[PDB]
Amino acid sequence: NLPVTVAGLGPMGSALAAALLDRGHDVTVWNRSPGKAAPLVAKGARQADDIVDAVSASRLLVVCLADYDALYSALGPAREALRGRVVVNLNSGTPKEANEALRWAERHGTGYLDGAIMVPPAMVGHPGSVFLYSGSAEVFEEYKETLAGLGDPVHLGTEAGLAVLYNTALLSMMYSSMNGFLHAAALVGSAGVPAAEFTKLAVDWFLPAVIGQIIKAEAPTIDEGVYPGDAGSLEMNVTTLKHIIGTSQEQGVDTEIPVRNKELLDRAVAAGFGESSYYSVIELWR
Amino acid sequence: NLPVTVAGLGPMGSALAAALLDRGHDVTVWNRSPGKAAPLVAKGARQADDIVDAVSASRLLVVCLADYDALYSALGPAREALRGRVVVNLNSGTPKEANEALRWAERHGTGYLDGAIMVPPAMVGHPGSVFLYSGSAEVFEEYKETLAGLGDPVHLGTEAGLAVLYNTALLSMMYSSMNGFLHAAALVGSAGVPAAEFTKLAVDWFLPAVIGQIIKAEAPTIDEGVYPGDAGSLEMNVTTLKHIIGTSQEQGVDTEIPVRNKELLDRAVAAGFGESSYYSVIELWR
Numbered sequence: 001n002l003p004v005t006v007a008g009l010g011p012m013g014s015a016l017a018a019a020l021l022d023r024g025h026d027v028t029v030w031n032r033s034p035g036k037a038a039p040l041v042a043k044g045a046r047q048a049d050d051i052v053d054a055v056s057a058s059r060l061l062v063v064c065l066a067d068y069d070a071l072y073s074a075l076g077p078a079r080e081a082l083r084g085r086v087v088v089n090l091n092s093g094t095p096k097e098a099n100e101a102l103r104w105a106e107r108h109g110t111g112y113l114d115g116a117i118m119v120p121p122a123m124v125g126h127p128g129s130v131f132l133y134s135g136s137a138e139v140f141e142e143y144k145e146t147l148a149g150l151g152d153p154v155h156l157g158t159e160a161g162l163a164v165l166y167n168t169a170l171l172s173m174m175y176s177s178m179n180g181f182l183h184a185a186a187l188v189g190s191a192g193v194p195a196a197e198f199t200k201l202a203v204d205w206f207l208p209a210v211i212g213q214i215i216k217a218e219a220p221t222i223d224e225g226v227y228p229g230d231a232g233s234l235e236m237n238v239t240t241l242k243h244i245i246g247t248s249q250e251q252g253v254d255t256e257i258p259v260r261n262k263e264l265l266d267r268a269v270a271a272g273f274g275e276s277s278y279y280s281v282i283e284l285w286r
Numbered sequence: 287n288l289p290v291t292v293a294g295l296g297p298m299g300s301a302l303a304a305a306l307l308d309r310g311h312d313v314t315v316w317n318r319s320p321g322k323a324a325p326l327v328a329k330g331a332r333q334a335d336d337i338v339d340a341v342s343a344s345r346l347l348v349v350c351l352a353d354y355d356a357l358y359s360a361l362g363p364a365r366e367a368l369r370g371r372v373v374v375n376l377n378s379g380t381p382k383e384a385n386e387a388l389r390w391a392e393r394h395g396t397g398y399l400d401g402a403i404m405v406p407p408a409m410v411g412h413p414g415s416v417f418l419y420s421g422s423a424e425v426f427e428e429y430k431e432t433l434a435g436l437g438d439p440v441h442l443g444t445e446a447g448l449a450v451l452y453n454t455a456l457l458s459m460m461y462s463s464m465n466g467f468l469h470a471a472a473l474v475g476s477a478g479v480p481a482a483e484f485t486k487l488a489v490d491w492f493l494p495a496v497i498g499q500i501i502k503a504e505a506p507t508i509d510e511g512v513y514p515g516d517a518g519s520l521e522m523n524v525t526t527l528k529h530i531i532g533t534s535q536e537q538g539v540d541t542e543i544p545v546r547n548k549e550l551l552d553r554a555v556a557a558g559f560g561e562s563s564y565y566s567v568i569e570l571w572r
């Protein structure tokens with residue numbers, strides 16, 4: 001029974017603590033407010049009312065505070081106790097805040113890893129759960145087996161802000177992809193095709209086999225940064241989008257999604273990228 | 287040697303004819319303009335200069351005309367010859383144009399299937415190639431084995447415009463998904479992460495395991511059309527997007543993609559959908 005402390009018992013922190021209890025750890029729990037520990041205590045956790053006692057219980061401190069709270073403030077009273085312990089911070093807001101907390105930790109003689117949880121609380125500890133980490137490689141090596149109880153642990157690198165940045169990036173990709181799916185679903189839905197039908201071709205096939213495979217085939221060319229347009233140019237795609245918009249209007253389906261996508265291309269054609277490949281649109285954003 | 291005619295020898299039509307030649311068919315080829323047949327004739331094709339002779343050569347007529355041309359016009363001189371033959375049209379512009387051509391075909395005593403080619407010309411006849419079809423089920427059954435030489439054939443239904451509509455829908459989804467990926471790539475790229483590195487997590491894992499699986503899990507709820515927001519509401523996602531925008535600005539990355547995604551949500555919150563789930567945004571578009 002390897003001791004672990006969880007500081008922060010919102011829905012996410014509580015799921016973390018429950019998962020660690022299920023794996024047989026000696027879990028100490030702390031929260032700014034009383035009343036959130038009882039369900040964890042009923043599962044074998046010990047509540048520590050004072051942060052110093054919670055910090056002192058364990059070398060591994062798993063922190064998941066509310067957004068508006070701050071590690072320096074929650075753990076400030078435990079300054080001295082933090083020396084020689086490790087913070088795994090699972091709720092940094094931004095990359096700069098991760099970097100700030102790493103320096104904070106260093107000043108106290110505390111190891112530091114930042115992590116981003118890629119699943120909802122109910123999925124923590126279950127197959128499918130992935131947690132992205134950044135910061136100390138040594139800390140990661142020390143604790144990866146314990147952290148694998150929470151989700152598949154992936155170390156991105158030493159820069160403290162890489163996990164929050166990846167999370168941010170993947171979510172940005174998710175919002176656009178989901179909108180694209182829903183626009184597509186509205187289009188086939190104008191002909192009576194249910195969304196659950198449409199997913200057989202859109203998700204089981206097109207998403208990985210077409211979108212995903214083209215991204216894989218194109219990514220080294222992106223990194224090269226020339227973007228030749230001989231196999232198909234950015235401006236040719238403005239034509240395809242005009243078509244999509246016209247078909248959408250014939251079907252009585254809203255055109256905001258394809259018109260905004262056409263505007264991203266018009267910006268690029270004004271900047272000089274029309275005869276480059278589609279992927280050159282990324283240069284307006286870097 | 288099963289005879290097939292290909293009418294239209296642009297890059298796509300030429301790829302179709304080449305694939306059919308590779309499968310051992312007796313291929314007759316026709317094009318409005320001379321000069322595009324020779325590479326196919328060198329592979330075993332017979333050029334027919336007159337459309338009537340091309341139509342009369344085969345029961346199965348695979349049509350892939352230029353966008354600005356029209357089946358009624360290219361095949362008009364072959365009116366009489368078309369009786370008792372079959373048109374597989376692989377280049378309708380819109381769903382209404384597909385439906386028009388089906389009626390056209392019916393008036394002539396000609397079977398009709400509309401198809402949408404989901405791969406580029408170089409991939410026609412190769413593993414990976416998928417062609418979506420709509421129209422006559424009988425025609426499809428008659429010729430699916432021949433059509434499988436071109437790509438995996440999928441019959442969507444009897445309505446003539448379903449394949450063009452699916453194509454339109456899937457492309458709309460592709461443009462948004464690709465933009466999302468490229469915005470994500472720009473975000474991690476601000477920290478020095480190459481796109482080809484980023485795809486290991488973004489495409490091999492996140493795309494299918496997260497985006498795809500959530501769409502599959504959510505699609506029946508979409509079709510139900512209630513969109514309860516108890517597990518997470520649309521307006522909560524406006525918060526996440528504000529976060530993405532703020533992190534993008536801290537990284538020096540353009541915010542157009544997440545700001546436009548936030549605007550789609552603001553439209554929905556103004557229309558009353560804020561406490562519904564994210565997926566309720568589709569109701570503004572249907």
Ligand SMILES: C[C@H]1NCCc2ccccc21
Binds near residue numbers: 171174175523564
């Ligand atoms: C599940 C929800 N939260 C994470 C990001 C996201 C993006 C698109 C649609 C829904 C959601």
Ligand SMILES: C[C@H]1NCCc2ccccc21
Binds near residue numbers: 237457460461464
């Ligand atoms: C490959 C190209 N043409 C088809 C649609 C599409 C959408 C996004 C990016 C590129 C392309």
Ligand SMILES: [Ca+2]
Binds near residue numbers: 252572
């Ligand atoms: Ca409508």
Ligand SMILES: [Ca+2]
Binds near residue numbers: 537
């Ligand atoms: Ca920049």
